[PDB]
């Protein structure tokens, strides 16, 4: 095949735009177009567009499908003790989503690598290593076995390369590295409303990661169930990167969907303010659902129920548990009936006079599959509740945009937990003369801020064994609990 | 030494300890009752509730949510009551700190907004507001007076940026300000502390103040000269307050209370608001920095946080009641401690700021006299629509800041907008969904701003937006419609 052969490619599919600046190349440049090109399917392509194209009531779960960590507290203690077996069996998997490019931080590195600004200063990606060696730790201290929680991490085209180098720049944080399971997503090219593939530059494609559902063909690509099934596996917690909170692998959140017979299950927290970013888990026509946050009405978002709390309060945290057998059936049949979908984007790009431009309107459109739009298929589907403050504090801006979700926001979150957890098994915090500080502290002058306190994954999981090194005594801030012993900051 | 011996009799003789080096220190030292302040700092530490404390009951709870079926009969109540010149506000703004990094008080705060107007304009606008809706409804311009209390460190400042703006159109003769007290700050061992060699470092004496500073400049007597009969109490730094909120009002008149509380509902249980509760039967709020976490925690079978009750610093009380407090009440009122690292002055003429807590400060809670009501109500709203305070600068904690301020008023413009039939759209004049995907560096939620004078609460904007498209940033005022 030459420059000829793939020119009359492109022109089948209304794509010979791609090729307008093809003279003006140098050589190199060539050679990487010509070669992203080849590896396209145009067919494919103007298929998903035109459906996308193409592409242009609720009800709430049942009270017999979600389970709640605060109301049901009496079988958490069940629920952990299921989680932490299935555990120590190395029946149970992660599958880290960390496909997500484009920083709206302001940087140019994946948010695994973000160090929200914790007194030990570790990344999203080092918290939630620790978890896992914690429960790796823990379920074999309660079974006396050795055990492994492989952990598969999606990545994108964007963030593939420098994830790899951090990971092995740290060395797995502890855990090995055949025990952690690199896969990259596919991607899609930003097209025009004319349904023509856009340029970023005169030999680049703007492309951009296929969206978190991307991840069943991404399964299927590089043969990742065949893997799980090869290791044994029975259960993957699936989750978001941006969360300084969330509880890899969370023995009572699997414990719980497997008492229930659960092939499918989604962690929520209760949304209180109508427009909160998050979608909300549902039902139409019997089937299972997450309605997006971008893709709800204002009438809905806002409806209340006879309680006073919204009608539709389970806020999906991106936090799924997903059976083997079947996210099997989904990679081998369901895939294909996900949709695509789109946003109206402003995509950088080439004009034809060779310059590039950022436009003013919109001129575009980016599709993409939802990770959750497979709930619809599972046979038993089920929800648990659990409290934001213990388990859901995302970072998705940087802290001057819109003064939520972003890295003061998170560490304050983690700080504030963790602060809470040595108050509850029995520790409390003194200034500087030892005078005892309350636990809602009073910030009144600028000097004044709230206490600083973190506990290392591998010291507590999620509050538990710490009166041994808290209990009836006092600590000046900031206070740092880990591996090498108790540490008041200076 | 007349007054040389006064500090004598009190211990406070250290307070001359500089004057060998003295006209000011001399008009503040003989202002200072110093046998009251000995009798207060003693009791204040002497000695130095969780378990008795209970949940707000239903009986005396009332919210504009789960009883929306009477927000339009108490509305109009309170409407009335207006439009009869017997309501009144007053706000408390003789705080001043330096958390926010500036030099004046909060009032006069800029947090970012489209038209860049400041917590007072955008609290007189309201108040106008109400005027102006209860002269059309009931037929007759009415007034609503607007107390306005300072403190020595915000009084100067304030007066002037009201005069400058020409009082945002209200009258300056129903704009009262008056001064509240203030204290001195305490060493533990109990001695005065001094600021300067020549200075005694001083600070408003808490919002709970308010009930001597009313003594002092005769204010309820002004308020029964008015013929007012309702006083709507609130916070300054809330960009969201519903200043002489119609509802609220309705509802404790409608509810024949002398006291009310507005609250919204507590969800985070280290939120810093103080919790509405009761202790051997009488009503009170636990400050947030005065509970234990236990009792923070504390859920209710629904789910709820026991005591959710959340202080939104507005309250109802009628002139009748205020003077029984002015009269009877204030001795009882007790001061609430905190330690502080204060800035001073020791021997040697050494100057240095403390980096370990040197003394205390007392402040008495504006709240601390609903345990002497005969029907206190509870009123609870919910906080997109009214409140989201400014207490910290951006560079902070990370919360209740400039930035918060700004976009919880426009997110509730921009929701006012969509309710009343209105439509944002892109560039393309596409229609932007309710709430938007913040994904690339440039995206920004939809900003929308709406004038008190146009829309007190989201009302009569139907000719303004209804079955129409708008590019935002959308401001729509007295001028009309502008999109920037
Ligand atoms: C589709 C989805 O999950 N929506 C949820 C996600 O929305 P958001 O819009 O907040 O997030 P998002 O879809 O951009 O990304 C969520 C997660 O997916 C990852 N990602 C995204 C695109 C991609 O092509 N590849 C990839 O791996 C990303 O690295 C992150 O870990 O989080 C919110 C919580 O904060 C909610 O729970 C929203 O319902
Ligand atoms: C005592 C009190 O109200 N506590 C409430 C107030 O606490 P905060 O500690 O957040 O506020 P704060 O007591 O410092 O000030 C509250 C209001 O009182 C004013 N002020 C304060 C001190 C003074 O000497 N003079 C004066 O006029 C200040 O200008 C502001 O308008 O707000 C929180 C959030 O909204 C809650 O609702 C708290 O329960």
Same mark, same amino acid.
């Given at each position: 095949?030459?420059?000829?052969?793939? *020119?009359?490619?492109?022109?089948?599919?209304?794509?010979?735009?791609?090729?307008?600046?093809?003279?003006?190349?140098?050589?190199?440049?060539?050679?990487?177009?010509?070669?992203?090109? /080849?590896?396209?399917?145009?067919?494919?392509?103007?298929?998903?567009?035109?459906?996308?194209?193409?592409?242009?009531?609720?009800?709430?779960?049942?009270?017999?499908?979600?389970?709640?960590?605060?109301?049901?507290?009496?079988? =958490?203690? %069940?629920?952990?003790?299921?989680?932490?077996?299935?555990?120590?069996?190395?029946?149970?998997?992660?599958?880290?989503? $960390?496909?997500?490019?484009?920083?709206?931080?302001?940087?140019?590195?994946?948010?695994?690598?973000?160090?929200?600004?914790?007194?030990?200063?570790?990344?999203?990606?080092?918290?939630?290593?620790?978890?896992?060696?914690?429960?790796?730790?823990?379920?074999?201290?309660?079974?006396?076995?050795?055990?492994?929680?492989?952990?598969?991490?999606?990545?994108?085209?964007?963030?593939?390369?420098?994830?790899?180098?951090?990971?092995?720049?740290?060395?797995?944080?502890?855990?090995?590295?055949?025990?952690?399971?690199?896969?990259?997503?596919?991607?899609?090219?930003?097209?025009?409303?004319?349904?023509?593939?856009?340029?970023?530059?005169?030999?680049?494609?703007?492309?951009?990661?296929?969206?978190?559902?991307? =991840?069943?063909? %991404?399964?299927?690509?590089?043969?990742?169930?065949?893997?799980?099934?090869?290791?044994?596996?029975?259960?993957?917690?699936?989750?978001?990167?941006?969360?300084?909170?969330?509880?890899?692998?969370?023995?009572?959140?699997?414990?719980?969907?497997? /008492?229930?017979?659960?092939?499918?299950?989604?962690?929520?927290?209760?949304?209180?303010?109508?427009?909160?970013?998050?979608?909300?888990?549902?039902?139409?026509?019997?089937?299972? /659902?997450?309605?997006?946050?971008?893709?709800?009405?204002? $009438?809905?978002?806002?409806?209340?129920?006879?309680?006073?709390?919204? =009608?539709?309060?389970?806020?999906?945290?991106?936090?799924?548990?997903?059976?083997?057998?079947?996210?099997?059936?989904?990679?081998?049949?369901?895939?294909?009936?996900? /949709?695509?979908?789109?946003?109206?984007?402003?995509?950088?790009?080439?004009?034809?006079?060779?310059? =590039?431009?950022?436009?003013?309107?919109?001129?575009?459109?980016?599709?993409?599959?939802?990770?959750?739009?497979?709930?619809?298929?599972? *046979?038993?589907?089920?929800?648990?509740?659990?409290?934001?403050?213990?388990?859901?504090?995302?970072?998705?801006?940087?802290?001057?945009?819109?003064?939520?979700?972003?890295?003061?926001?998170?560490?304050?979150?983690?700080?504030?937990?963790?602060?809470?957890?040595?108050?509850?098994?029995?520790?409390?915090? +003194?200034?500087?003369?030892?005078?005892?500080?309350?636990?809602?502290?009073?910030?009144?002058?600028?000097?004044?801020?709230?206490?600083?306190?973190? +506990?290392?994954?591998?010291?507590?999981?999620?509050?538990?064994?710490?009166?041994?090194?808290?209990?009836?005594?006092?600590?000046?801030?900031?206070? +740092?609990?880990?591996?090498?012993?108790?540490?008041?900051?200076?």
């Amino acid at each position: 095949m030459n420059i000829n052969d793939l *020119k009359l490619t492109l022109s089948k599919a209304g794509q010979e735009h791609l090729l307008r600046f093809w003279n003006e190349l140098e050589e190199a440049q060539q050679v990487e177009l010509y070669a992203e090109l /080849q590896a396209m399917n145009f067919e494919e392509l103007n298929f998903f567009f035109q459906k996308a194209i193409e592409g242009f009531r609720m009800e709430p779960v049942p009270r017999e499908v979600l389970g709640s960590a605060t109301r049901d507290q009496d079988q =958490l203690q %069940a629920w952990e003790s299921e989680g932490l077996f299935q555990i120590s069996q190395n029946k149970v998997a992660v599958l880290l989503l $960390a496909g997500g490019q484009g920083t709206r931080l302001g940087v140019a590195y994946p948010k695994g690598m973000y160090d929200v600004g914790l007194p030990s200063r570790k990344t999203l990606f080092q918290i939630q290593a620790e978890r896992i060696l914690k429960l790796q730790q823990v379920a074999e201290k309660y079974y006396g076995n050795k055990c492994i929680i492989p952990w598969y991490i999606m990545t994108s085209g964007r963030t593939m390369e420098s994830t790899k180098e951090f990971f092995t720049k740290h060395k797995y944080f502890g855990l090995k590295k055949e025990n952690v399971i690199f896969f990259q997503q596919g991607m899609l090219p930003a097209m025009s409303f004319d349904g023509k593939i856009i340029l970023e530059e005169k030999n680049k494609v703007s492309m951009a990661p296929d969206g978190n559902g991307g =991840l069943y063909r %991404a399964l299927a690509a590089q043969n990742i169930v065949e893997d799980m099934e090869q290791r044994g596996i029975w259960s993957i917690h699936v989750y978001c990167v941006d969360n300084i909170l969330v509880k890899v692998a969370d023995p009572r959140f699997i414990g719980f969907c497997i /008492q229930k017979g659960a092939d499918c299950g989604a962690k929520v927290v209760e949304k209180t303010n109508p427009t909160e970013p998050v979608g909300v888990v549902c039902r139409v026509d019997g089937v299972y /659902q997450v309605v997006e946050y971008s893709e709800i009405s204002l $009438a809905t978002a806002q409806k209340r129920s006879s309680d006073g709390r919204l =009608l539709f309060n389970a806020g999906n945290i991106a936090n799924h548990f997903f059976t083997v057998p079947f996210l099997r059936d989904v990679v081998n049949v369901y895939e294909p009936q996900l /949709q695509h979908h789109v946003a109206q984007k402003k995509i950088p790009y080439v004009d034809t006079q060779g310059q =590039l431009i950022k436009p003013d309107k919109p001129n575009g459109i980016k599709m993409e599959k939802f990770v959750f739009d497979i709930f619809q298929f599972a *046979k038993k589907f089920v929800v648990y509740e659990v409290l934001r403050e213990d388990e859901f504090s995302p970072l998705k801006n940087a802290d001057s945009q819109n003064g939520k979700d972003n890295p003061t926001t998170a560490r304050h979150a983690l700080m504030s937990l963790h602060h809470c957890w040595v108050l509850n098994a029995g520790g409390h915090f +003194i200034d500087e003369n030892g005078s005892r500080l309350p636990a809602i502290p009073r910030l009144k002058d600028a000097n004044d801020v709230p206490i600083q306190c973190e +506990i290392s994954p591998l010291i507590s999981y999620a509050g538990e064994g710490l009166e041994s090194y808290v209990a009836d005594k006092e600590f000046h801030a900031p206070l +740092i609990i880990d591996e090498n012993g108790v540490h008041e900051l200076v």
